Amino acid sequence: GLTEEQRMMIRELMDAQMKTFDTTFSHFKNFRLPGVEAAKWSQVRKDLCSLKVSLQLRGEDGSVWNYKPPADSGGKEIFSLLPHMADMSTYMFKGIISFAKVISYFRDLPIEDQISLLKGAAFELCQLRFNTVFNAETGTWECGRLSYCLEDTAGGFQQLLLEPMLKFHYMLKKLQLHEEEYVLMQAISLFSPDRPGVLQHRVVDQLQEQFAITLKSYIECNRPQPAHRFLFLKIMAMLTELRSINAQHTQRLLRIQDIHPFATPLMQELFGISLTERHKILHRLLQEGS
Amino acid sequence: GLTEEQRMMIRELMDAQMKTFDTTFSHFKNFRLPGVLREEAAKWSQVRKDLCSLKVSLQLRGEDGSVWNYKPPADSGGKEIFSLLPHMADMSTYMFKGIISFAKVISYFRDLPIEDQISLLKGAAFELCQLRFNTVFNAETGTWECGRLSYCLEDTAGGFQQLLLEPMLKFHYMLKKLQLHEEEYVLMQAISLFSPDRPGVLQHRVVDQLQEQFAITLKSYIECNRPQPAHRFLFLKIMAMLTELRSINAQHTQRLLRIQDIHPFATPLMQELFGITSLTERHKILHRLLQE
Ligand SMILES: CCCCCCN(c1ccc(C(O)(C(F)(F)F)C(F)(F)F)cc1)S(=O)(=O)c1ccccc1
Ligand SMILES: CCCCCCN(c1ccc(C(O)(C(F)(F)F)C(F)(F)F)cc1)S(=O)(=O)c1ccccc1
């Protein structure tokens, strides 16, 4: 029940996702691992305690390495997983950049608007991809050999749900979205006309409307159950909440970087720590081939 | 009580143990860890059998409070069965160096020909290491507590019964049940070290006499420092454990040689101790270690 222009849009996005989402994380290697002014710290310790995960590294041989993090005994021990987290995030950001590069509507845009769109949506598209590997029953992101498990708390669900990034994950997972709906959410978030720096506002706004129309038409053609009533509007509301979480995450990251520098060079360009001149890695990655 | 020469014998051995047994393993660093990655096929079948016993998980408690844990892989095609061998060799070599230092600080051992010192260390190195490992063994948790490192036996099947089939696990459990004192542990080490019937020993009667005096001291220590109508046969129980330990030593040498043939892993010190390719010129690391 979709137009062939909508049908080609969906499969160009789904082919893009297949080519640029390493769902098994097989090509992620050479990552750092945990080893074997006063007012600021209180905020930073809060920002990092709400995201207390354990790491499981499985080997092709069948062996398993497990890392339980250090409990809060003050400081410098709260930054144990930060180097690894910056390596994984940079790897995901590169996959997001490659995702946008192979989409025709994105590469046909000015390189400065391509930089502005990727700076505003990198975190958001990374969360959408991570939701597809999130296990809500075990609170674990299953990333191939790497698994990230939320540490059990006495609060019990309620405490974790006070973290907005976690409740987004549990609520988006509850919608039980298809692959096509996640990749249309990625396109709608990527082609955001009101991101800082964007110049071709109308061009991007017109592109965003077509993606949103395609998603509404896809849902109408494949999800007629009462469980999926108002699903399109729920997804659009979820995307609005994701934009709010994105702004919070940028503020958290800048606060941690000020007291403990950890960001990779690509994260510094994406989070603001001649656009093309200030964003050389992004400029090089976007001129490179897919 | 004990004769004055017997008390000084225990004091030299205790002084030996204190100076050379890193009971917290604080100085065991820079060790390798498992990574995050026709007729010879009859040799491979024997080695698979040789390496199933070593179902141990490794735990690394960090200074910050973090914990790293390692489940060994299940035997598949092969090679993964050798994942813990580099680490185990580093630990064995570290323990072997502490055993050589123990023998070096004993007067009765230094006054022997260097070639008999080497022959005794080649025959008893594994046994003295197991005796020291028993003192850090927790029978209730099946875990060797080596400071920040822990080696926990993985529940293979039934459990206690299936594990007690491996002679070395049985040894650790039976020896731990005797609840020996530090002085009795160190006297076991001396009796095992001064064994006259080790391959290559020449001064057999001097070594045999030295072993008898250590055994008499241990027998006298038990009669004078333990409730006697209860520990009547503890000395004889200890001697039977040492006899079984000598048998387990020979099984381990054969197991180790079989693995080394198809998968070399032994450190240079292990190669000299286990005969992997005159006595002075073939044992030069041991020679330097015994002559500082
Ligand atoms: C540290 C808690 C991880 C889970 C919490 C939510 N996730 C997240 C985590 C950290 C960031 C950081 O930017 C921050 F500084 F905020 F910690 C980073 F630098 F550490 F990476 C961003 C998103 S997650 O994407 O789902 C994700 C990321 C890596 C592995 C699995 C899942
Ligand atoms: C295969 C024999 C198993 C005997 C019981 C297990 N132990 C053991 C394991 C391997 C060896 C080897 O010699 C072998 F060749 F068998 F593989 C070594 F080279 F790997 F180190 C020796 C003793 S342990 O004493 O309890 C020990 C050693 C180091 C750290 C913690 C515990």
Curated annotation (Swiss-Prot), chain B:
List where in the cell it is found: Nucleus
Where in the body, by tissue, does this protein show up? Expressed in liver, colon and small intestine.
Amino acids binding hyperforin: 92, 130-133, 252
Identify the keywords attached in UniProt to this record, alphabetized. Answer: Activator, DNA-binding, Metal-binding, Nucleus, Receptor, Transcription, Transcription regulation, Zinc, Zinc-finger
Any single Gene Ontology cellular-component annotation: chromatin
Domain NR LBD span(s) in chain numbering: 5-277
Entry keyword Cell wall biogenesis/degradation: no
Q: Does the keyword Metal-binding apply?
A: yes
Q: Which GO terms describe its molecular function?
A: DNA-binding transcription activator activity, RNA polymerase II-specific; DNA-binding transcription factor activity, RNA polymerase II-specific; nuclear receptor activity; nuclear receptor binding; RNA polymerase II cis-regulatory region sequence-specific DNA binding; RNA polymerase II transcription regulatory region sequence-specific DNA binding; sequence-specific double-stranded DNA binding; zinc ion binding
Q: Principal place where this protein is found?
A: nucleus
**GO biological process: any one?**
xenobiotic transport
Family membership, please give it: Belongs to the nuclear hormone receptor family. NR1 subfamily.
Q: What does this protein do?
A: Nuclear receptor that binds and is activated by variety of endogenous and xenobiotic compounds. Transcription factor that activates the transcription of multiple genes involved in the metabolism and secretion of potentially harmful xenobiotics, drugs and endogenous compounds. Activated by the antibiotic rifampicin and various plant metabolites, such as hyperforin, guggulipid, colupulone, and isoflavones. Response to specific ligands is species-specific. Activated by naturally occurring steroids, such as pregnenolone and progesterone.
Q: Relate the assembly described in the record.
A: Heterodimer with RXR. Interacts with NCOA1. Interacts (via domain NR LBD) with CRY1 and CRY2 in a ligand-dependent manner.
The entry's protein name is Nuclear receptor subfamily 1 group I member 2
Q: Which organism is it from?
A: Homo sapiens (Human)
Q: Which residues of the full protein are shown?
A: 142 to 432 of 434
